Design an enzyme around this catalytic site. Structure first.
Site, mmCIF file in Angstrom:
data_model
loop_
_atom_site.group_PDB
_atom_site.id
_atom_site.type_symbol
_atom_site.label_atom_id
_atom_site.label_comp_id
_atom_site.label_asym_id
_atom_site.label_seq_id
_atom_site.Cartn_x
_atom_site.Cartn_y
_atom_site.Cartn_z
ATOM 1 N N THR A 74 1.923 -4.582 4.235
ATOM 2 C CA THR A 74 1.735 -4.850 5.631
ATOM 3 C C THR A 74 1.234 -6.315 5.876
ATOM 4 O O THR A 74 1.616 -6.971 6.859
ATOM 5 C CB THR A 74 0.730 -3.849 6.207
ATOM 6 O OG1 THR A 74 -0.513 -3.983 5.537
ATOM 7 C CG2 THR A 74 1.205 -2.378 6.047
ATOM 8 N N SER A 131 1.219 -7.768 -0.759
ATOM 9 C CA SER A 131 1.905 -8.822 0.014
ATOM 10 C C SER A 131 0.996 -9.966 0.463
ATOM 11 O O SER A 131 1.491 -10.952 0.989
ATOM 12 C CB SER A 131 2.615 -8.290 1.251
ATOM 13 O OG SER A 131 1.745 -8.058 2.327
ATOM 14 N N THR A 135 0.799 -1.231 0.000
ATOM 15 C CA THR A 135 0.000 0.000 0.000
ATOM 16 C C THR A 135 0.842 1.297 0.000
ATOM 17 O O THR A 135 0.413 2.305 -0.568
ATOM 18 C CB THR A 135 -1.008 -0.045 1.169
ATOM 19 O OG1 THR A 135 -1.953 -1.113 0.923
ATOM 20 C CG2 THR A 135 -1.762 1.267 1.342
HETATM 21 N N1 LIG Z 1 -2.865 -5.759 1.132
HETATM 22 C C1 LIG Z 1 -1.853 -4.646 1.266
HETATM 23 C C2 LIG Z 1 -2.089 -3.932 2.623
HETATM 24 C C3 LIG Z 1 -1.141 -2.813 2.906
HETATM 25 O O1 LIG Z 1 0.066 -2.896 2.523
HETATM 26 O O2 LIG Z 1 -1.613 -1.825 3.605
HETATM 27 C C4 LIG Z 1 -0.481 -5.298 1.128
HETATM 28 O O3 LIG Z 1 0.027 -5.903 2.071
HETATM 29 O O4 LIG Z 1 0.140 -5.306 0.038
#
Ligand SMILES: N[C@@H](CC(=O)O)C(=O)O
Ligand SMILES: N[C@@H](CC(=O)O)C(=O)O
Ligand SMILES: N[C@@H](CC(=O)O)C(=O)O
Ligand SMILES: N[C@@H](CC(=O)O)C(=O)O
EC number: 3.5.1.1
Lengths: 326, 306, 306, 326
Positions: free
Chosen positions: C69, C38, C12
């Site tokens: 995250t 991720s 993100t």
């Molecule tokens: N789904 C996202 C969530 C984020 O990074 O805030 C990721 O991990 O790529």
């Protein structure tokens, strides 16, 4: 869309420094207009109207600004759909409980601040203020008392407190939890405070010019009695003890406060420990000394209610029941 | 089995022979230093404690101090700065009465001795052992008024956890403790006088003025937020700081450091920031600081190393 | 100023030149390794990452990996076991979108570089930097689904806190990491297959049976309580453990260790206890364990050292 | 004094080992009588009556014991003033929500367990059981749903969960906080669950012999789809995803569950993260795939409600509204 009135009092939310990447800053600088304009999505949710009451760091918060706030809200209630109060973080938890006990307006009052200054990188104040307006705009937000909205979370004015000196996530209702979480401008409320707030309280500050004088003394090893004797010397209406463990007192401080209780000074045992109640029926025979135990109210919060309780009564049984009801 | 000494000071945990299983793990001897509720803990008791330990170090393999919960976190950090002995010093109390349903003291005691007797407990500074957890004496504090689980190291976490009479250690305090501090208390019978004052909206300067007029050596402020000062209190402390009173800004907030470079020019007023030391902990260090020096700058460097 | 390399992987936080102040503290170069959310992180990306770092170590003064995250805590612990470079490797993501009100990524990025560039960050293993906090790659995990403050080291706490572009370090991980592990991934392009199965009341053995019938190299159980197993699942895993599948008992509970010597005889069934490693973390170690050995006893000693 | 019925199901509360100072123990050993008799102050607060339903570790908890519990409570309601259920800790949070959704008896139901065995030094089970009886005895305890009482704290059956593998203080309502704290056999309630419980739910298990089959799949890096395909292969009525971050899915698992949703299998996105909601209107277009987001329900809790929801409906919009109401 709803009409929301922003009552600005200062804080870091309206604070600035000369670098986006340095911690240094000064408070009570930026006007309410800059704040609104720093959140140009406020248009999407409400017709906002900003008023500057004072512009101070909340470390210099005081009885007179509290009185000003409560009368202004109570006076202006028929003029708006909701209130947001922009305020410093440091004493937000004191002001939120004060208004929780004294606002009679049946429309939501939502306090908001920021742990980074307006000028800082990834400053928290814009999104906080947006979520404050969402919360004050939400019909479901009514009959929950005075609220604080920080870091996507709606917290009741009684239990809400700082847990960390610097964390944007600092504000928590540490004993009973939040009322609701905020996602994408919508709130899922699962809780409401049970203790009596707002129009179900007796406290009516409309005709008050000042508040009874209540001080706070800290306990610790080899504690001095000189702070306690100072407040008694000056004829303080009340003293709150920030006790050790479960509201316990160092023997010198105990002795001073015991004497004081007997000459009419109201004495509330609270605790310097950040969670859990100062209870009756532990190591201190309260009834004997004419003391009051604070329950879950921390020292600064127990000060707020003891001051208001002292506008109604000086009888320590009546004040104990107030501390069991509000 | 190791030789372990209990140094009793009172507290709820006594209110050895109820815990016969300690024989499984150590040879203990008990010795009554004082018998008080720790809400009445004081400088003299602290001084007795440090001296006793320092003197009896060679004669035992570790120390367990039974203590009230109310101020254990203070006594812990005092000893953490003053004990010169390199053997484990472990503090323990109880949140429930000795005679109550599910009293915590027995197993607390048991686990304190396990910790005192573990060779890997050595050189980690003075420890608090509560609720199956080993906690460093600097960061350790109460979180809750009555919870058996109340003792936590709220900023940097615990050193380890205790299960089936073994500890898996994963951390050690980095701040200098015990024999790496210059504090030496062996010849002292009084400590510099140091008071605490509380901040909040419409705060009285009366407490701060009353410690100043008593000629106190230091004043710790329990600040609002990041160690901020109500205007009246600020004004009084600013004066105190140049009139021969040491001034430490701490916070009433339970976690995080009271930092430099926020809203207060510590250098201009002659103040010290406490970092993560809460007001009662900052007091301890301040007292000991004042036995070495009265210069703010020097006191700031101490608050930065220990 | 130090040379710092960003290794981008998506997340993100990208959805350098928005953070012009990084020039104040470093000379950065960016390099796109992959660009994925991720939630779709995989073995191949991990392998690429470890290899890249290990190879480019000498050429830069530290590393910052931008990442989602969702699974950063996994990628963190993988690299924490496999990076042989002694220079800081710092992971960072963002809990709010790059274009949202009060986006966290900029200051997150800023602080990651401060950490990557601090000489005292060296030799602490691979780090996660989120919300003004430095977090060790083993214990670091999400606590909340959306909170900017979500990343915490929930069992042993953080290494330090970041204020005004400086870190006061108070802790370092004790478990062996990076160059003190025997794991070497430089010649590998696939990792031993390792699955996770969930326990709860009336749990199906179907998931566990389906990984067994695929010939998986390991199975991590997300146990109930202290790593306990619903009867059907227990029965299936007991069989797996003697039929050439490695079996680690972890917990679905967010904190505390899955211990030996409770209700399960690990030795009899040939199981391993994960200690404080949650199921996704236990997986990581298990994969790497399986590149050294298939003996349960040997795998238990690895879970005890790293 | 009040009549309280103890319904025993096993757990470590009724667990034993051969040393007071070793961790090793076995579950489902000790009868309810030993337990009562280990708390000879129970006389002071209630007329207790013990019944052994099963004697199992709660790790082996199942749909049939849930069904047994709910029918027995609903059948026996007129016979007692209150219920305490002795139960293992591991799946207490699942059973507490099950009964929260299915008990129609308007008298308190309080679950209790212990994190140390009955034979252990400073065992927690006696005091827990006492505070459970106090809570079930308290008139104020009614109309709060099904409760758990651990470590001096009253926690609502929906939000209550384990936070730590071994801590006596493990049980917390991690999202919305506790209902009340207990001191000296008395409770100060400040909160009640807002979501619908007990007799304000549709779920009526009186004539049920079994429950729809709902499974749980975990997400992580390089996640296999073989668990998800196993459950779909076996014709599972529902699958709950223990997602990454905010309910997100690994692409292989996603694909399997997407297909499943379209052939009638109900699919709920929850999260493996221990606090905060799996939300709508994030990275997954739920309406498109016919998925349901779990809100604050963790995977094992979302399983409970999805099973009950599947006794009423198979329409994913109806199930989503159930997940917004209960
Ligand atoms: N789904 C996202 C969530 C984020 O990074 O805030 C990721 O991990 O790529
Ligand atoms: N001192 C400031 C801190 C902040 O608002 O973040 C205040 O309370 O006004
Ligand atoms: N007031 C007692 C509390 C306790 O130990 O539980 C003490 O500290 O001595
Ligand atoms: N395995 C046990 C753990 C406990 O009750 O403490 C159970 O849930 O039955």
């Amino acid at each position: 869309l709803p009409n929301i009135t922003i009552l600005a009092t200062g804080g870091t939310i309206a604070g600035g420094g000369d670098s986006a990447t340095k911690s240094n800053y000064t408070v009570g600088k930026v006007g309410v207009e800059n704040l609104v304009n720093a959140v140009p999505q406020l248009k999407d949710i409400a017709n906002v109207k900003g008023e500057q009451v004072v512009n101070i760091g909340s470390q210099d918060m005081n009885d007179n600004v509290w009185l000003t706030l409560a009368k202004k809200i109570n006076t202006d209630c028929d003029k708006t759909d909701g209130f947001v109060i922009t305020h410093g973080t440091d004493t937000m938890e004191e002001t939120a409980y004060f208004l929780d006990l004294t606002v009679k307006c049946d429309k939501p009052v939502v306090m908001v601040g920021a742990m980074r200054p307006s000028t800082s990188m990834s400053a928290d104040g814009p999104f906080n203020l947006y979520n404050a307006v969402v919360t004050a705009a939400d019909k479901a937000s009514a009959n929950r008392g005075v609220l604080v909205v920080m870091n996507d979370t709606v917290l009741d004015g009684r239990d809400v407190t700082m847990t960390n000196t610097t964390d944007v996530a600092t504000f928590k209702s540490v004993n009973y939890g939040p009322l609701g979480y905020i996602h994408n401008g919508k709130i899922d409320y699962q809780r409401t405070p049970a203790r009596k707030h707002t129009s179900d309280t007796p406290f009516d500050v409309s005709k008050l010019n000042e508040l009874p004088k209540v001080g706070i003394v800290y306990n610790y090893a080899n504690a001095s009695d000189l702070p306690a004797k100072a407040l008694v010397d000056a004829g303080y209406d009340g003293i709150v003890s920030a006790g050790v463990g479960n509201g316990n007192l160092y023997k010198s401080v105990f002795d001073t406060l015991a004497t004081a209780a007997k000459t009419g000074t109201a004495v509330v045992r609270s605790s310097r420990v950040p969670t859990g109640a100062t209870t009756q029926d532990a190591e201190v025979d309260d009834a004997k000394y004419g003391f009051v135990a604070s329950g879950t109210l921390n020292p600064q919060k127990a000060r707020v209610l003891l001051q208001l309780a002292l506008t109604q009564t000086k009888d320590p049984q009546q004040i104990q029941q107030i501390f069991n009801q509000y």
